[PDB]
Amino acid sequence: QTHIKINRGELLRGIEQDHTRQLPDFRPGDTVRVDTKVREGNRTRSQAFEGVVIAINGSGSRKSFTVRKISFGEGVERVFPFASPLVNQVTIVERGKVRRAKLYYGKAA
Amino acid sequence: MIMPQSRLDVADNSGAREIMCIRVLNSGIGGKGLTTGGGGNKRYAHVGDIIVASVKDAAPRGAVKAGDVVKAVVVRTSHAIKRADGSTIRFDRNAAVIINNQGEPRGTRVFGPVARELRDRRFMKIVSLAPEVL
Amino acid sequence: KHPVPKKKTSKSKRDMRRSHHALTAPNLTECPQCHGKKLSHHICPNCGYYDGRQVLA
Amino acid sequence: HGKAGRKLNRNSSARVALARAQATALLREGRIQTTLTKAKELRPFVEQLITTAKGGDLHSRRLVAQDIHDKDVVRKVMDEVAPKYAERPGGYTRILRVGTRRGDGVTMALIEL
Amino acid sequence: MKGILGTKIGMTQIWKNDRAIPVTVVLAGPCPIVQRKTAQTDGYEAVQIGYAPKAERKVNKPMQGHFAKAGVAPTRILREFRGFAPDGDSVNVDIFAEGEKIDATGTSKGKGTQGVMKRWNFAGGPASHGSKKWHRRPGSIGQRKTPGRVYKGKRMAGHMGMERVTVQNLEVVEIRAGENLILVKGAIPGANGGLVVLRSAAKAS
RNA sequence: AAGGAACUUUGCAAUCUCACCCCGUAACUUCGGAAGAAGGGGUCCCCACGCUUCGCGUGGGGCGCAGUGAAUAGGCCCAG
RNA sequence: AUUCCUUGUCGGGUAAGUUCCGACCUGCACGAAAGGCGUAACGAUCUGGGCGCUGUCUCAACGAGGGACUCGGUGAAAUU
RNA sequence: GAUGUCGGCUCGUCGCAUCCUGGGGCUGAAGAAGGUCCCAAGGGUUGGGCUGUUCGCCCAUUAAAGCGGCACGCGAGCUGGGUUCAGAACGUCGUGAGACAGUUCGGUCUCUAUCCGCUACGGGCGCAGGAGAAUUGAGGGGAGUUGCUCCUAGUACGAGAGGACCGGAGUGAACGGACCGCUGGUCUCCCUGCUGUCGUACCAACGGCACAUGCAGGGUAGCUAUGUCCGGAACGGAUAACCGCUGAAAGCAUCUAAGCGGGAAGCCAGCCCCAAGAUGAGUUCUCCCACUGUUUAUCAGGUAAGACUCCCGGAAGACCACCGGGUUAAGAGGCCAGGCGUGCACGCAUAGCAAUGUGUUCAGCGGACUGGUGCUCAUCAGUCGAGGUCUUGACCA
Ligand SMILES: [Mg+2]
Ligand SMILES: [Mg+2]
Ligand SMILES: [Mg+2]
Ligand SMILES: [Mg+2]
Ligand SMILES: [Mg+2]
Ligand SMILES: [Mg+2]
Ligand SMILES: [Mg+2]
Ligand SMILES: [Mg+2]
Ligand SMILES: [Mg+2]
Ligand SMILES: [Mg+2]
Ligand SMILES: [Mg+2]
Ligand SMILES: [Mg+2]
Ligand SMILES: [Mg+2]
Ligand SMILES: [Mg+2]
Ligand SMILES: [Mg+2]
Ligand SMILES: [Mg+2]
Ligand SMILES: [Mg+2]
Ligand SMILES: [Mg+2]
Ligand SMILES: [Mg+2]
Ligand SMILES: [Mg+2]
Ligand SMILES: [Mg+2]
Ligand SMILES: [Mg+2]
Ligand SMILES: [Mg+2]
Ligand SMILES: [Mg+2]
Ligand SMILES: [Mg+2]
Ligand SMILES: [Mg+2]
Ligand SMILES: [Mg+2]
Ligand SMILES: [Mg+2]
Ligand SMILES: [Mg+2]
Ligand SMILES: [Mg+2]
Ligand SMILES: [Mg+2]
Ligand SMILES: [Mg+2]
Ligand SMILES: [Mg+2]
Ligand SMILES: [Mg+2]
Ligand SMILES: [Mg+2]
Ligand SMILES: [Mg+2]
Ligand SMILES: [Mg+2]
Ligand SMILES: [Mg+2]
Ligand SMILES: [Mg+2]
Ligand SMILES: [Mg+2]
Ligand SMILES: [Mg+2]
Ligand SMILES: [Mg+2]
Ligand SMILES: [Mg+2]
Ligand SMILES: [Mg+2]
Ligand SMILES: [Mg+2]
Ligand SMILES: [Mg+2]
Ligand SMILES: [Mg+2]
């Protein structure tokens, strides 16, 4: 409704690509180790989630991926944006033989 | 998002097996002891807000008993927590730690992880008892 | 329940209501070939002419 | 509101059974007389079906075999018409607005190849 | 004062330092001067400029005369900004610095004739407690014989949206200058491929 | 989604549950009963083996989120 | 199902119980085939509590189908 | 010849005898925290347990959990629990039929708005030519809530314990507005898996039907709240209670009797939205012009600028309206590429007695998304649409 010829998608990319990063070929069901970093007050710690990967979603800057682990008897999943600076290095560990693409059904485990 | 009827489980050895919510409040934890609310409302409780709660189940032997009331602080929203990078957490089961009026717990420790936001809002001690601070 | 009208309505209003029901007249044109009259963007019904012939005479 | 399609006051199972019989005849006889709407409904679905059939491989013929149920017609678009359509990128159909009618009083149309 | 025009291109996710800021992308392709109105001319203090371009053919005669009065080439769209001044013609560099709070105005996405819910946030009705045909209806309009009317402006079903909406104090995350692209913190009302005007904040703080 | 009777005059309504097989089953009792109490587990496809068959037990394999895979199909309990 | 005083007093359950259950006895105004007090089982009866499940609710959302709306055909009503 | 009643629910809006919040006087007011009274109605006023209940008691909070009016507001708005019909039982009255503002169980709340009123949206005409756009803001609506923490400060005060005003900085509830990038929902045929049965002759592959998706699994665009962004202000003018300056009547004293300053969450202005039907109809830029018709026809006609009509569509919308495109053309569809979605097609090969597995296959399939592309349709044309009344007045020839 301003009519103006323009590639919405490509200005989109123009921005949302400086803020974009690619990772290891994980397909879902692959187990993975993310080496996450935390800041505690001036100091920068370093935890590490390590789980079955259940969902990759979207793309470009907004591309994300959800891990799921059992940490101390209580079950917990967690979802990273491919390009969050509080996420340092992902590392495939296993390659799952997965028949679906979203892996929700494994929340009975 | 916890609200008044929510039966969360308990992370402590304070003898409360299972506690059910009953009000919410919105006190930080500053100065002398805990404080008194943002106000009336706040219709929901999520991770590190306090909730007043009644006690639904307990250990046949332990500090705190079957009916005992008493304020708890949340540790495991089955809901989801968005941290200012985009990271999201979520725990499969809903849970809390029981506490006293200066903050720290009637427990001797904590079972299962806790969300780094408890650290945000200065619950030192519970964060310390915590087996994992995700 | 069961709303009805309070008072019978007048010839006057009633025909002010009808004030619009007035039909709009097909705006027509003459159809370059067979020569009856066609509706704009449709087929001139006599011959069958949209630019050559389609539906038949 | 970026949605897209027609509900054509039928359900959803119907909607299909329609544009499948309608594609079935448009392919069965070069042009058809039918409501202007139901036509602008039958345009891009027949069209896409042209682009399935335009391909040769057995697949494309089972791909078509799903929507267009009668062998003769399938075979027609597969073997006969689609090939004929080779060098042309689209526009395998066109639409003509005739006029009115008595009962329903609805505008009407010819849709052709 | 401060102001310029451009399009709503899209909402996206980007990072400054460590946080997921959500940013909506505005464009503000150069706007040209067209009309400069002063008191001794038109009473009030303003400037009319223009956004999306248009080819001489699809253009009126009058509008042509207009756009020709200051050698400009037609813009599909005109608009005014009260109490401005510049010199030359108007882009976003020279107008915004990164971080400056700004008031962003658009039209909304409109919704058609909308329920008492959707429209005005009405309560509702006990979806299963015997409640004949009263599931979505606002209940009562008044009192009784007094006053015996219905109040002026009593909220009820109505065309929702397509309003002119302004949202206040928004922050210029990023200026992709001479690509006339603007990044702005958060929401901006009215649909993608939108027409929006970025003006300085109304306020101060 | 999170919660799970906070609804309300009352869980009104709607979901739960759902068939067949095998384990197992309370106070109370007029010894018939309660009782399908409760609560579990199995259920599909293939190959071999036995058995009274169309059939079925057993053993090993196979696949999908799930196998009365779709439809017909009890929510249960305590106490007046 | 009977209680005026009445939310009687006490206990149980609840975080909190005019309801409900037990006891109490000062039965306004129980009582023995106009049956009295019990009781297994039976109940689309009535009353309270629980477990389970749930848009009943917090707080509503998206979707679907049939209306409502538009066009051509036929065209009522109570009221006045 | 009918004004339907309690209570709930929905919806509201007024009063101020003010529950909170804001300002002040008094104090048996050191501070903190209070009592009480004057000003003050802008906004705000929680969730449950019992009872038909209003009410009231309790649970747990709160700045506060205000009091009342609007036919004890609100049934052509919903409930239908209380009471008021017929059935039945219990107590009590009555010899009886029957009885009781005693109790108890059950017990039909009636699809079409004519007018005023209201929310929205058009059609007409008006606004001294006929048009395309840009607008001043008369005046009118929304909005106005509040805690907690921290600094000032362990400072003033006070043996002490405790503990400020003022100012300044943050963080949050509820409400509102918008938004779909995130997190999720849904996504009625986008992709996949399933069964019983029918059919495409059979196998293999598919399609129906099992919803009005047969079931299950995911699910883009759009739409959404649980998600996100932003807000309530600052400042200024005039006030209330109140505090004072100069100061006479009444040589003194006096805020007042002439005059003057200060003074609130309130009024006006400031903020967001509508707004010249503001008939008092405003202003500005631009465009078309001074046409033709025996007044036997003192008003029409053909046209300019421009516009509709009609087709094609849209993040606009029930209709109308609104935005774009209409071949000088990228408007939509299709087509190509890509994205995203499903997750590894058919066939064939291979392994296996088979069920199946592996390969070929990051494979195949494809609703909305992003661009490119003249393959399709937006073809032809029909319909309107100016000639500018008078009066004075100033200015030019
Ligand atoms: Mg998702
Ligand atoms: Mg939140
Ligand atoms: Mg107990
Ligand atoms: Mg119809
Ligand atoms: Mg069907
Ligand atoms: Mg719309
Ligand atoms: Mg509702
Ligand atoms: Mg009146
Ligand atoms: Mg759930
Ligand atoms: Mg029921
Ligand atoms: Mg026995
Ligand atoms: Mg059983
Ligand atoms: Mg498996
Ligand atoms: Mg199994
Ligand atoms: Mg059933
Ligand atoms: Mg008691
Ligand atoms: Mg008897
Ligand atoms: Mg019987
Ligand atoms: Mg209860
Ligand atoms: Mg009709
Ligand atoms: Mg009457
Ligand atoms: Mg007063
Ligand atoms: Mg008020
Ligand atoms: Mg009265
Ligand atoms: Mg009343
Ligand atoms: Mg009434
Ligand atoms: Mg009743
Ligand atoms: Mg007697
Ligand atoms: Mg009407
Ligand atoms: Mg005004
Ligand atoms: Mg007026
Ligand atoms: Mg107002
Ligand atoms: Mg200090
Ligand atoms: Mg001290
Ligand atoms: Mg909100
Ligand atoms: Mg998106
Ligand atoms: Mg989504
Ligand atoms: Mg044969
Ligand atoms: Mg077969
Ligand atoms: Mg069939
Ligand atoms: Mg059949
Ligand atoms: Mg059927
Ligand atoms: Mg589905
Ligand atoms: Mg002043
Ligand atoms: Mg593609
Ligand atoms: Mg298809
Ligand atoms: Mg396209």
- Phi, psi for residue E160 in degrees, rounded to 5: -105, 120
Helix (H, G, I), strand (E, B) or coil at D38: helix
CA-wise closest residue to B129 among B113, B94, A97, A94: B113
Which of D97, D107, D111 would you mutate first to test chain C, the one with the most C CBs within 10 A?
Answer: D97
Q: What is the dihedral of CA B63, B65, B68, B70, to 10 degrees?
A: 40
Nearest nucleotide to D11 (CA to C1') is G65
Q: Is B35 exposed, middle or buried (0-12, 13-18, 19+ CB in 10 A)?
A: middle
CA D48-D53-D57 angle, 5° bins: 135
Burial A69-107, CB ≥16 within 10 A → b, else e: eebeebbbbbbbbbbbebbeebebeeebebeeeebeeee
The closest CB to that of B92, out of A40, A49, A74, belongs to A74
Q: How far is Cα E4 from Cα E91, in angstroms, rounded to an integer?
A: 7
In chain A, which residue's Cα lies nearest the Cα of B92?
A75
Task: Judge whether B36 is closer than 8 Å to chain A, CB to CB.
Answer: no
Nearest nucleotide to E129 (CA to C1') is F12
Q: How far is Cα D106 from Cα E122, in angstroms, rounded to an integer?
A: 41
Q: What is the residue whose two structure tokens read 């979203």?
A: A102
Residue E159's Cβ-side half-sphere holds a number of Cα atoms within 13 Å equal to: 6
CA-wise closest residue to B131 among B76, B92, B78, B89: B76
What are the extents of the domains in chain A? Answer: 1-109
- Sign of the torsion angle spanned by Cα atoms E63, E64, E70, E72: positive
Distances (CA, A) of E45 to A25, B33, E33: 61, 58, 15
CA of B28 to C1' of H147 (A): 12
Element (H, E) at C28: strand C28-29
CA of D11 to C1' of F72 (A): 25
For chain A, the straight-line distance linking the first and the last C-alpha, in angstroms and rounded, comes to: 51
Q: How far is Cα B64 from Cα E158, in angstroms, rounded to an integer?
A: 56
Ligand nearest to the CA of D14: 5
- Report which residue type is found at A97: K
Distance of CA D28 to the CA centre of its chain: 10
The closest CB to that of A1, out of E18, E29, E194, belongs to E194
Contact criterion met (CB below 8 Å) for E57 and E90: no
Instruction: Please state, as a whole number, how many other Cβ atoms lie within 10 Å of the Cβ of residue D109.
Output: 24
Report chain E's C-alpha Rg in angstroms. 23
Breaks (C-N over 2.5 A) in chain E follow: none
With an 8 Å Cβ cutoff, the interface of chain C facing chain D consists of: 39, 41-43, 45, 50, 54-55
Q: Where are the alpha helices (DSSP H) in chain E?
A: 39-42, 62-68, 116-120
Q: What is the residue whose two structure tokens read 């999201």?
A: B88
CA A81-A85-A90 angle, 5° bins: 65
Helix (H, G, I), strand (E, B) or coil at A64: strand
Sheet holding D108-112, edge to edge: D31-35, D108-112, D94-97
Burial C4-29, CB ≥16 within 10 A → b, else e: eeeeeeeeeeeeeeeeeeeeeeeeee
Q: Which residues contact A32 (CB under 8 A, 6 or more apart)?
A: A24, A26, A50, A51, A53, A67, A90, A91, A92, A93
Domain containing residue D56: CATH number: 3.90.1030.10
Partners of chain B (3+ Cβ pairs below 8 A): A, E
Q: How far is Cα E139 from Cα C30, in angstroms, rounded to an integer?
A: 58
Q: At what angle do helices D13-28 and D43-53 cross, to 10 degrees?
A: 70
What resolution does the deposited structure have, in angstroms?
A: 3.0
Distances (CA, A) of D76 to A89, B15, D25, D91, D111: 58, 79, 11, 19, 18
CA of C25 to C1' of H297 (A): 30
Cβ of B80 near strand F (under 7 Å)? The reply is yes
Helix (H, G, I), strand (E, B) or coil at D60: helix
- Domains observed in chain B: 1-134 (2.40.150.20)
Contact criterion met (CB below 8 Å) for B71 and B85: no
Cβ of B35 near strand H (under 7 Å)? The reply is yes
Helix (H, G, I), strand (E, B) or coil at D79: helix
Q: How far is Cα E76 from Cα E51, in angstroms, rounded to an integer?
A: 7
- Determination approach: X-ray
Contact criterion met (CB below 8 Å) for A32 and A93: yes
Q: Are strands B9-10 and B95-98 parallel, antiparallel or unpaired?
A: parallel
Q: Does A74 sit within 8 Å of B112, measured CB to CB?
A: yes
Q: Which residues contact E172 (CB under 8 A, 6 or more apart)?
A: E96, E97, E98, E99, E100, E102, E182, E183, E184, E185
Question: A105 C-alpha to center of ligand 12: Å?
Answer: 28
In chain A, which residue's Cα lies nearest the Cα of B133?
A47
In chain C, which residue's Cα lies nearest the Cα of D36?
C42
- Number of structural domains found in chain D: 1
Residues from chain A contacting residue B93 (CB–CB below 8 Å): 74-75
Look up residue E71 and give its two tokens: 């050698």
Catalogue the E-assigned strands of A1-109. Answer: 31-35, 49-57, 64-71, 74-80, 89-92
Residues, CB within 5 angstroms of ligand 5 (ion): D 13
DSSP E179-202: TTEEEEES--SS-SSEEEEEEE-S
What are the extents of the domains in chain E? Answer: 1-205
C49 in a labelled binding site: no
Contact criterion met (CB below 8 Å) for B72 and B43: no
Domain interval for residue D102: 1-113
Look up residue A89 and give its two tokens: 């290095």
Q: Is A8 exposed, middle or buried (0-12, 13-18, 19+ CB in 10 A)?
A: middle
Cβ of E115 near strand H (under 7 Å)? The reply is no
Report the largest interatomic distance among the alpha carbons of chain E, rounded to a whole angstrom: 71
Contact criterion met (CB below 8 Å) for E99 and E171: yes
C44 in a labelled binding site: yes
- Report which residue type is found at B85: D
Question: E190 C-alpha to center of ligand 18: Å?
Answer: 65
SS (H, E, C) chain B: CECCCCCCEECCCCCEEEEEECCCCCCCCCCCCCCCCCCCCCCCECCCCEECEEEEEECCCCCCCCCCCCCEEEEECCCCEECCCCCEEEECCCEEEEECCCCCECCCCCCCCECCHHHHCCCHHHHHHCCCEC
The closest CB to that of D99, out of C45, C50, C54, belongs to C45
Burial E74-109, CB ≥16 within 10 A → b, else e: bbebbbebeebeeeeebbbeebbeeeeebbbbbbeb
Q: How far is Cα E190 from Cα E9, in angstroms, rounded to an integer?
A: 11
The closest CB to that of D96, out of C39, C45, C50, belongs to C50
